[PDB]
Amino acid sequence: PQVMDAKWALQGNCVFLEHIEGEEIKFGTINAENGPVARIQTYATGFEYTKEMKDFNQTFSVEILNKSIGESYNALLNHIHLSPIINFNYKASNKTAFKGETNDPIWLGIWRTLTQAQKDTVIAKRQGNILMASSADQIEIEMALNGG
């Protein structure tokens, strides 16, 4: 469908307070937990070229447009799926600082930063098995992921 409905579930609540002698017992409570909602969207594009361009232009042909459809299509896909990650307004809980500045380190001292991130993703139970970064930091990250 265009929009996907959310999951639902019920849970109870109770506390086991202390009982003195009369201490009329305090009853529990239930609540309903509902999941998130997701929707699919339509992305589209195209071309419009005169018949003259097809016939008189030797270099022109539909394959150049079909090739450009693929490039702009795959480029959309990794954008649509990853741009939420990049564009999100991260809070202080999700932001881990450099944590590894120290003083006069080799710039494999990003190892201190990645180590902190693995610690922070394990304190909260959102353990991160996959990293994403720019290619500008490929060398330092590769050194950190090996025997520094």
Partner: peptide, 18 residues
């Protein structure tokens, strides 16, 4: 060309390193 696609993402999964 057109396509029907959707994506669901959350803050519960990520940590921003600097």
């Amino acid at each position: 060309g057109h396509c029907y696609r959707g994506a669901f993402a959350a803050v519960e999964e990520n940590v921003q390193e600097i």
